[PDB]
Amino acid sequence: GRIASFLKNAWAKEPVLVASFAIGGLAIILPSLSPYTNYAIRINRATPYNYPVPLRDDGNMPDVPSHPQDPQGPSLEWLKNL
Amino acid sequence: DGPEKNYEKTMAILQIEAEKAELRLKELEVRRLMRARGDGPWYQYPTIDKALIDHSPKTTPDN
Amino acid sequence: ELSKVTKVKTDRPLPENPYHSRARPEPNPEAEGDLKPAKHGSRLFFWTM
Amino acid sequence: MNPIIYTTLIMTVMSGTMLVMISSHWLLIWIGFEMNLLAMIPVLMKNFNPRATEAATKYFLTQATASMMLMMAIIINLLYSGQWTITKMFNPVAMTMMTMALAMKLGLSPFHFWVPEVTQGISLQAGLLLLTWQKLAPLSVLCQISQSINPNLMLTMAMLSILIGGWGGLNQTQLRKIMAYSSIAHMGWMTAVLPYNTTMTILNLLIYITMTLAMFMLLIHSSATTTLSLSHTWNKMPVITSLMMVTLLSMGGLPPLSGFMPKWMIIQEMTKNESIIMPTLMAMTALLNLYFYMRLAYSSSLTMFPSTNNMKMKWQFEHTKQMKLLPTMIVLSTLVLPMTPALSSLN
Amino acid sequence: MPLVYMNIIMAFAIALAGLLMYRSHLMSSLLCLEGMMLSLFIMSTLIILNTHFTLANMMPIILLVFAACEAALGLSLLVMVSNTYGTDYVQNLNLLQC
Amino acid sequence: TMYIAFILSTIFVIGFVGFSSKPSPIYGGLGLIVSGGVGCGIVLNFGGSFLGLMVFLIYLGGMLVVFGYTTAMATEMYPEVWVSNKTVFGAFVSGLMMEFCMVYYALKEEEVEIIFKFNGLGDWVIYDTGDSGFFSEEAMGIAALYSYGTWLVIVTGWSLLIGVVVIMEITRG
């Protein structure tokens, strides 16, 4: 009732502010309600800005990939299909 | 009361006051030595915490 | 794949002091046992307690 | 000024002081000082008068110069040490510059000139904040760097502050200027023991804060800004002027009143460090402050001055505004001497 | 130290001397304040860049922000003096003595 | 060209003398303009592209509002220049002489100690030989303000808002 009258009056007298608050409101709410924000984070972590310094192999590192391109290690196959 | 009551009270008071004086001199000397050396629990001015140092592979190999 | 962290199996010994650091100074003595009240309270001039 | 806006400005001043007293980074201490100045200027100019604008401008200029010198000292210390932490400053020139800046912020002489003017320009409400709360942050910074403070410079500033505060207080008939010069003298007293024992500085700061809160709140409760206007208060409210006389006697440093505690402890600590001439001179120079306090006590309560006929109407009405902390501040500033061994809690 | 550090410190000193030595206008004092702020910015920036203190590269921007905050404070005080006296002359600030 | 930074710093000092002698605020404005531009040049020469451009941009915008006021508050029927008053000219000449004396003493005498110890060698010496890679180290450190410096962002934003409030409260009568 009162909200509808206020919004109709707002968009009839000051339509500029109505759009700005709507656009500003979406910019705060939508990022939280999105499944791609985590992908945006992962992409930033994925980019290798600095050298991947190797670690000395003590023989007890099963998952650490002592190799050029053997299967062990993180994969960017998710980004390829994005 | 008897003359011995004041006698013993005076002895106790003298013991307490002499202990206080000796402790005050001892405290002054201890504080002076701690401030001069900084090897005691007092006058321990803070230094940089070593837990802030980042012991991780940096960008340049020479660290 | 060229950005992954790899294991390197070497034989050169791991450096013991890469920074050539000096001997760390001996820390101050650390605390003591339980607490007891001050001998005669606060020994501040005429205050007996 | 809207009360909400005034509360926000007061909270911003307090948050600036808490930022100064809470951070471990020099940049944040400087930021807190800047916020304090920014939120203090409009508080100084809450009541718009040309005198208020003049006070705000002078205070802003002085604090801006002090903040610039402080930031220069911080930058030089970083240059010569690569450190931002509040610790033993590693450059003597930077230490000197920082000491000058902090003394200018506190109003230590010969950077005392702005205090009597800014205090007189602003109202009693703003004067109380200026003379009590605005001393916390620079004193805290000085207490954090007391190890690196050159004792000679700080002692010279303290002695000059006491001398100049006493001398200035003697020629003043405006209550706010008398309070400002007394504040200068007490700041000198506080900064005298900074190189020796900072807990005595904290004790003196607390006692001075209580005494000044009591005095300013009594002045507000009497709505008096001059000796003549305060003299009339004996007729309407003798209790206020009697309590003012007691608080003035306490400020003079007369036992058994609480004002003897800071001077006594300061003399003790300075004699423990084999300094006997400086505390003696400070004690002797406190007599000027005691003089102008006594003169005020005469004009206010000890002697009765001529009132005016219109006070008869004022006799019928009772004060509406009630300062709840005034009795506690009066008691703590007059009858706490039997409680000095509480000094340890400040450690 | 390099000579550029000497020049920047000297510039800060000159600006400080200028601010401490008023002549007539309050605007020139604010100019000296802004000059000191600029000199401090340049000094801090050179120090941070030279030592590669990456995380401290945001310090000069904060310094600049509070610098122009103080400048706005000064400008507002200036307008009030002009409104109350007609000129920004520093001699009009004379009511408060001692 | 191996002493570009030194020349720019000398021009910095010259501009500081120029607006420190207190000519008409209009002329102090261009003095500060020159000083800010030359400082931007120095910071650019030391690798601070964003920082130098930032001081250049902000002061350029700030001195504009000062100019607006110089024509509204500090407007003298006869605005004074550096060669209009013997006091202003004396201050300008004294500053120039001080700068020239210190420059000469620093150059001809390699090690100079006025208050700090200054070395007469070129500023190029202190530069580092490291490689930043695919980085603008200054830019990354500055952008770390929103990730690392959340507290700084909060305090600065609050100070700016309170600054707006303070300006409105001051300029209300």
UniProtKB/Swiss-Prot annotation, chain D:
Documented EC number(s)? 7.1.1.2
Q: What is the predominant subcellular site recorded for this chain?
A: mitochondrion
Give the UniProt subcellular location, in the record's own words.
Mitochondrion inner membrane
Q: Which GO terms describe its cellular component?
A: mitochondrial inner membrane; respiratory chain complex I
- Stretches that traverse the bilayer: 3-23, 25-45, 59-79, 89-109, 149-169, 178-198, 200-220, 237-257, 274-294, 325-345
Q: Which UniProt keywords apply?
A: Electron transport, Membrane, Mitochondrion, Mitochondrion inner membrane, NAD, Respiratory chain, Translocase, Transmembrane, Transmembrane helix, Transport, Ubiquinone
Q: In the UniProt record, does the keyword Mitochondrion occur?
A: yes
Q: What biological-process terms (Gene Ontology) are attached?
A: mitochondrial electron transport, NADH to ubiquinone; mitochondrial respiratory chain complex I assembly; reactive oxygen species metabolic process
- Catalytic function, reaction form: a ubiquinone + NADH + 5 H(+)(in) = a ubiquinol + NAD(+) + 4 H(+)(out)
| InterPro entries linked | Complex_I_Subunit_2, NADH_DH_su2_C, NADH_UbQ_OxRdtase_chain2, ND/Mrp_TM
Topology versus the membrane, per the UniProt entry? Multi-pass membrane protein
Annotated GO molecular function terms are: NADH dehydrogenase (ubiquinone) activity
Protein's UniProt keywords contain NAD = yes
Pfam families per the UniProt record, alphabetical: NADH_dehy_S2_C, Proton_antipo_M
- What function does the entry list? Core subunit of the mitochondrial membrane respiratory chain NADH dehydrogenase (Complex I) which catalyzes electron transfer from NADH through the respiratory chain, using ubiquinone as an electron acceptor. Essential for the catalytic activity and assembly of complex I.
Subunit composition and interactions: Core subunit of respiratory chain NADH dehydrogenase (Complex I) which is composed of 45 different subunits. Interacts with TMEM242.
Family per similarity comment: Belongs to the complex I subunit 2 family.
Write down what this protein is called.
Answer: NADH-ubiquinone oxidoreductase chain 2
From Swiss-Prot, chain E:
- Record's subcellular location: Mitochondrion inner membrane
Principal localisation: mitochondrion
Is the keyword Membrane in the record?
Answer: yes
Instruction: Give the E.C. number(s).
Output: 7.1.1.2
Q: Tell me any Pfam family this protein matches.
A: Oxidored_q2
Q: How does it sit in the membrane?
A: Multi-pass membrane protein
UniProt KW keywords: Electron transport, Membrane, Mitochondrion, Mitochondrion inner membrane, NAD, Respiratory chain, Translocase, Transmembrane, Transmembrane helix, Transport, Ubiquinone
Give the main EC class: translocase
Entry's Gene Ontology cellular component terms: mitochondrial inner membrane; respiratory chain complex I
Q: Which domain of life is it from?
A: Eukaryota
Q: Which is a GO BP term held by this UniProt record?
A: ATP synthesis coupled electron transport
User: What do we know about how this protein assembles, alone or with others?
Assistant: Core subunit of respiratory chain NADH dehydrogenase (Complex I) which is composed of 45 different subunits.
Family listed: Belongs to the complex I subunit 4L family.
> What does the UniProt record say this protein does?
Core subunit of the mitochondrial membrane respiratory chain NADH dehydrogenase (Complex I) which catalyzes electron transfer from NADH through the respiratory chain, using ubiquinone as an electron acceptor. Part of the enzyme membrane arm which is embedded in the lipid bilayer and involved in proton translocation.
In Swiss-Prot or TrEMBL terms, this protein is called: NADH-ubiquinone oxidoreductase chain 4L
Q: Which gene encodes it?
A: MT-ND4L
Swiss-Prot record, chain F:
Q: How does it sit in the membrane?
A: Multi-pass membrane protein
Q: Name one Pfam family in it.
A: Oxidored_q3
This entry's Enzyme Commission designation comes to: 7.1.1.2
Keyword annotations for this protein, in alphabetical order, are: Electron transport, Membrane, Mitochondrion, Mitochondrion inner membrane, NAD, Respiratory chain, Translocase, Transmembrane, Transmembrane helix, Transport, Ubiquinone
Q: Any one Gene Ontology biological process term? A: mitochondrial respiratory chain complex I assembly
Give the location in the cell.
Mitochondrion inner membrane
Annotated Gene3D superfamilies: NADH-ubiquinone/plastoquinone oxidoreductase chain 6, subunit NuoJ
Q: Does the keyword Transit peptide apply?
A: no
Q: Where are the transmembrane segments?
A: 1-20, 24-44, 46-66, 87-107, 148-168
InterPro entries, per the entry: ComplexI_Subunit6, NADH_UbQ/plastoQ_OxRdtase_su6, Nuo/plastoQ_OxRdtase_6_NuoJ
What is the catalytic activity of this protein?
A: a ubiquinone + NADH + 5 H(+)(in) = a ubiquinol + NAD(+) + 4 H(+)(out)
Q: Does the keyword Secreted apply?
A: no
Give this protein's Gene Ontology molecular function annotations: NADH dehydrogenase (ubiquinone) activity
Q: Which GO terms describe its cellular component?
A: mitochondrial inner membrane; mitochondrion; respiratory chain complex I
- Broad EC category: translocase
Q: Which domain of life is it from?
A: Eukaryota
Subunit: Core subunit of respiratory chain NADH dehydrogenase (Complex I) which is composed of 45 different subunits.
The record's family statement is: Belongs to the complex I subunit 6 family.
Q: Relate the protein's function as given in its record.
A: Core subunit of the mitochondrial membrane respiratory chain NADH dehydrogenase (Complex I) which catalyzes electron transfer from NADH through the respiratory chain, using ubiquinone as an electron acceptor. Essential for the catalytic activity and assembly of complex I.
Please give the name of this protein.
NADH-ubiquinone oxidoreductase chain 6
